[PDB]
């Protein structure tokens, strides 16, 4: 009966992690069946990192240019028999299919959605955590050198939903990656160049869920009879760095169980954005937008 | 590079999770070699919860009073051939040794130390998170009905360091369990009786580590030339709900890499405790004591 940042048990994804090496650069890869996905900037030499032509680099590559290694479980050196490019990713074909490939789809997450990340270094998973695709299409994770290729995923039912592969840290401290169709979140460029991300915004539907979790945990000092409509809140949300509140059935279940209307929490969000009264909500003196409405329904 | 709450990859522990059923009650169990550890209150009937004689309950039980089931991976016919009691735990002996038993040690964690938890329900893992053993010998996790038996662990090197098994929820978001020697953290009783935990306290060495992580991430607005000695801070800590600061070599490295003395941060704690002037330290308006000095050195 509490709310903590929770990640899916990584036992499925650990067996899929490999180490792809192309020349002098090496990063992580995802081994599903006879396919190994890895960020395409492993082909780029350090000399041409500012103006790389990945179309020409892919042409200059042969199957022997790449080296895939499996360090976890029973080790195995994978022979690369094919190399292709899909967006900002490499689609390598290996001679051995992963015997532990879980049921998987490739789905792109929207802002506000949360997913688990398996941080890996040299093809060895070291840690796992949960991040939210921020409205500026970035994630607030913990990535070090060589973590490129770490995989973000979900599990709807018995299917692992791959949705993120770590691509780069922007030197602003900003982590970003691409979906498994190659399209980089936020249209960030692979090349090394000055890149500034858009201004971040609070995920309004995640704050409402977090407040519902506090009420379910016996913390409802912030609940007042005052209400602000969803239409009026979205107008206020424009001029104060907040996302448009779009109610879902997951939020409706929290409204019924707690008995607190959504418009009651939208008003409370405005007052809480103007500062707390010194009191804490679930051990936090700040608005927490990292818990989705489905995350709250699950943990309660 | 960032700083987040990070859990160990749960692949090793997922292969050890089983389901223990003693008559009408059912909880999770840890399957290591031929031994299945589980909370001893599974053999207690619902009508004898207020005052159970576990010495008499263990006598009344036989090997067929328990039934262990493996749901994860390849299911197995787990036959119980022996039952013993160790403190607040049951040491069941099964006819099959777990083929995926990792190298494991049993260690009691001290307050302030962090460890990863694999929450399970009916012997099936559902989520993972990291908790710090609070000074009042509780943990602030997210457990639901049927979560008892969930395992807390570390991984030093290639060895899983088991240190926690879930026992009971004391209040909303307040949980406690026992070490794998049987002794329950904080001497909390198994019976359903009034139990009040001690007043919680901030882990001073974890706050110092968390401030060092902010300095390494370019967030050092709180650093001032002022210093308060460890001896003076510990006197203040006694009357302000703080733990005695005992410097380690892990904290010394952060003091060298940042150039900020430990005494400087001890003074900043005594100022930030009163309040953050609307200024965020790594996106937090409160003192975070959930990051150990070893956790900061790893994530930087
Ligand atoms: C990932 N392993 C590294 C390398 N990297 C990177 C960025 C851009 C490009 C190119 F050529 F422009 F396309 N190539 C490589 C990058 O951003 N890295 C990275 C990623 N996440 C975190 C960190 C932390 C520290 C150092 C490097 C990081
Ligand atoms: C864990 N599976 C449940 C059960 N439980 C509990 C059962 C018996 C006894 C006693 F007194 F020893 F006999 N004590 C405790 C308990 O505390 N549970 C539990 C644990 N964590 C979280 C929750 C949340 C909701 C309901 C029960 C929880």
Q: Which residues contact B74 (CB under 8 A, 6 or more apart)?
A: none
Task: State how far the Cα of B279 lies from the Cα of B127, in Å rounded to an integer.
Answer: 33
Residue numbers preceding breaks in chain B (C to N > 2.5 A) = none
Does the beta carbon of B172 lie under 8 angstroms from any beta carbon of chain A?
yes
Residue B133: both structure tokens together: 């053993």
SS3 A245: coil
Both tokens of B6, joined, read 């990070």
* Secondary structure letter of residue A7 according to DSSP: B
For residue A7, list chain B residues with Cβ-Cβ distance below 8 A: 7, 127-129
Structure tokens at B94: 């099964």
H or E stretch including A177? Answer: strand A175-178
Could you give the C-alpha distances from B101 to A5, A246, B76, B77, B105, in angstroms and in order?
A: 28, 47, 15, 17, 12
| Residue B265 CB neighbour total at 10 angstroms | 29
DSSP class of residue A241 equals T
Q: Nearest 10 degrees: CA dihedral of B285, B286, B289, B290?
A: -50
Record the tokens describing residue A286, joined without a space: 């700040």
Distance CA A98, CA B181 (A): 39
Given a contact cutoff of 8 angstroms between Cβ atoms, the answer to whether A187 and A136 are in contact is no
Q: Which CATH superfamily is domain B201-300 in?
A: main proteinase (3clpro) structure, domain 3 (1.10.1840.10)
- Cα A52 to Cα A65, B80, B95, B152, B215: the distances in Å are 17, 63, 61, 47, 34
Confirm if B125 and B68 have CB atoms less than 8 A apart: no
Q: What does residue A100 show for φ and ψ, rounded to 5 degrees?
A: -115, 40
What is the distance between the alpha carbons of residues A74 and A91, in angstroms, rounded to a whole number?
23
d(CA A272, CA A259): 20
DSSP A187: G
| Chain A residues within 8 A of B300 when measuring between CB atoms | 144
- Angle, vertex CA B256, rays to CA B251 and CA B259, nearest 5: 115
CA of A121 to the centre of ligand 1 (A): 12
Sequence-distant (6+) residues with CB within 8 A of A136 are A186, A197, A198, A199, A200, A201
Look at residues B26, B25, B29 and name the one whose alpha carbon lies nearest to residue B38: B29
Label residues A18-41 b or e (16+ Cβ within 10 Å = b): bbbbbeebbbbbbbbebbbbbbbb
Resolution (A): 3.0
**Cα A74 from chain centre:** 29
Residue A178 DSSP one-character state: E
**Strand residues in A65-113 grouped as ranges (E):** 66-70, 76-78, 80-86, 89-94, 104-106
Answer for the pair A289, A206: CB distance below 8 angstroms, yes or no.
yes
Compare CB distances from A218 to B125, B129, B172 and report the shortest one's residue. Answer: B172
Give the whole-angstrom CA distance, residue B222 versus residue B205: 17
CA–CA separation, A211 and A207 (whole Å)? 6
CA of A243 to the centre of ligand 2 (A): 39
Q: Do B8 and A127 touch (CB under 8 A)?
A: yes
Instruction: Quote the longest CA-to-CA distance of chain A.
Output: 68
B279 has a chain A CB within 8 A of its CB? no
CA dist A30 and A38 (Å) reads: 7
CA atoms of A18 and A122, how far apart (whole Å)? 8
CA distance B173 to A4: 9
Q: Does the annotation mark A175 as catalytic?
A: no
d(CA A71, CA A101): 16
A36 close contact with B: CB closer than 8 A: no
User: Ligand 1 centroid to B279 CA: how many Å?
Assistant: 30
Contacting residues of B for A160, CB less than 8 Å apart = none
Which CATH code is given to the segment(s) A15-102? 2.40.10.10
Catalytic status, residue A16: no
Query: Could you give the CA distance from residue B222 to residue B209 in angstroms, rounded to a whole number?
Result: 14
Given a contact cutoff of 8 angstroms between Cβ atoms, the answer to whether B148 and B27 are in contact is yes
What's the rounded Cα separation, in Å, for the pair A70 and A268? 51
Enumerate residues 6+ apart whose C-beta is below 8 A from A203: A111, A112, A132, A134, A135, A243, A289
C-alpha of A124 from chain center? 19
Q: Is B166 in contact with B147 (CB distance < 8 Å)?
A: yes
What are residue A165's DSSP bridge partners?
A: A151, A178
Q: Same CATH fold, A15-102 and A1-14+103-200?
A: yes
Residue among B9, B125, B276 minimizing CB distance to A118: B9
| Token couple for A72 | 């976890």
Distance CA A290, CA B232 (A): 38
Q: How many CB pairs under 8 A join A and B?
A: 118
Residues in the ligand 1 pocket, defined by CB under 6 Å: A 27, 41, 44, 49, 143-148, 166, 168-169, 175, 190-192; B 1
The dotted CATH code for A1-14+103-200 is 2.40.10.10
Domain residue spans of chain B: 1-14+103-200, 15-102, 201-300
How were these coordinates obtained? Answer: X-ray
- Give the closest residue to B114 by CA, choosing from B240, B233, B203: B203
CA distance B201 to chain A (A): 13
Q: What per-residue string of b and e applies to B7-20 under the rule 16 or more CB within 10 Å gives b?
A: bbbbbbbbbbbbbb
Mark which residues 214-253 of A lie under 8 Å from B by CB: 217-218
CA atoms within 13 A on the CB side of B107: 16
Q: How many CA atoms lie within 13 A of B83 on its CB side?
A: 24
Q: Output the CA–CA distances (angstroms, integers) from residue A97 to A10, A16, A26, A64, in the order listed.
A: 20, 10, 21, 18
Order of strands across the sheet that contains A76-78: A76-78, A66-70, A17-22, A25-32, A35-39, A89-94, A80-86
If one counts every other C-beta atom within 10 angstroms of the C-beta of residue B100, the result is 14
What string of H, E and C letters represents the secondary structure of chain B?
CCCCCCECCCHHHHCCEEEEEECCEEEEEEEECCEEEEEHHHHCCHHHCCCCCHHHHHHHCCHHHEEEECCCCCCCEECEEEEEEECCEEEEEECCCCCCCCCEEECCCCCCCEEEEEEEECCEEEEEEEEECCCCCCECCCCCCCCCCCEEEEEECCEEEEEEEEEEEEECCEEEEECCCCCEHHHCCCCCCCCCCCCCCECHHHHHHHHHHHHHCCCCCCCCCCCCCHHHHHHHHHCCCECCCCCCHHHHHHHHHHCCCHHHHHHHHHHHCCCCCCCCCCCCCCCCCCCCHHHHHHCC
Choose the mutation target among A142, A160, A173, A298 for the interface with B, i.e. most B CBs under 10 Å.
A142
Element (H, E) at A127: strand A124-132
Residue B58: is it exposed, middle or buried by C-beta count within 10 angstroms (0-12/13-18/19+)?
middle
Residue-wise burial string across A112-140, b where 16 or more C-beta atoms lie within 10 A, e elsewhere? bbbbbbbbbbebebbbbbbbbbbbbbbbb
Q: Are A55 and A190 in contact (CB under 8 A)?
A: no
Residue B3 touches chain A, beta carbons under 8 Å: yes
Residue A10 region, left (φ>0) first, then alpha (ψ -120 to 50), else beta?
A: alpha
Whole-angstrom CA distances from B52 to A165, B42, B57, B66, B190 are: 52, 11, 8, 18, 9
CA of B192: how far to CAs of B39, B41, B51, B177, B252, in Å? 14, 10, 7, 14, 45
3-state secondary structure of A93: strand
């Amino acid at each position: 009966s509490g709310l903590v940042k929770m990640s899916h048990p990584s036992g499925d994804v650990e067996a899929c992690m490999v180490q792809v090496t192309c020349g002098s650069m090496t990063l992580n890869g995802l081994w599903l069946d006879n396919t190994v996905w890895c960020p395409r900037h492993v082909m780029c030499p350090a000399d041409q990192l500012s103006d790389p032509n990945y179309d020409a680099l892919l042409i200059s590559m042969t199957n022997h240019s790449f080296s895939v290694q499996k360090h976890i479980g029973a080790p195995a050196n994978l022979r690369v028999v094919g190399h292709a490019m899909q967006g900002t990713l490499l689609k390598l074909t290996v001679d051995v299919a992963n015997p532990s490939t879980p049921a998987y789809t490739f789905t792109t997450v929207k802002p506000g959605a949360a997913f688990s990340v398996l941080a890996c270094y040299n093809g060895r998973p070291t840690g796992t955590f949960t991040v939210v695709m921020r409205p500026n299409y970035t994630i607030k994770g913990s990535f070090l050198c060589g973590s490129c290729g770490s995989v973000g995923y979900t599990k709807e039912g018995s299917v692992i939903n791959f949705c993120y592969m770590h691509q780069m840290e922007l030197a602003n401290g900003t982590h970003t990656g691409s979906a498994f169709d190659g399209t980089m979140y936020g249209a960030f460029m692979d090349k090394q160049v000055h890149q500034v991300q858009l201004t971040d915004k609070y995920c309004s539907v995640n704050v409402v869920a977090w407040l519902y979790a506090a009420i379910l945990n016996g913390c409802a000092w912030f609940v007042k009879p005052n209400r602000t409509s969803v239409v009026s809140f979205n107008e206020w949300a424009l001029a104060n760095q907040f996302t448009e509140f779009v109610g879902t059935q997951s939020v409706d279940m929290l409204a019924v169980k707690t008995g607190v209307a959504i418009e009651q929490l939208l008003y409370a969000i405005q007052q809480l954005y103007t500062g707390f009264q010194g009191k804490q909500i679930l051990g936090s003196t700040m608005l927490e937008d990292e818990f989705t409405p489905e995350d709250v329904n699950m943990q309660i």
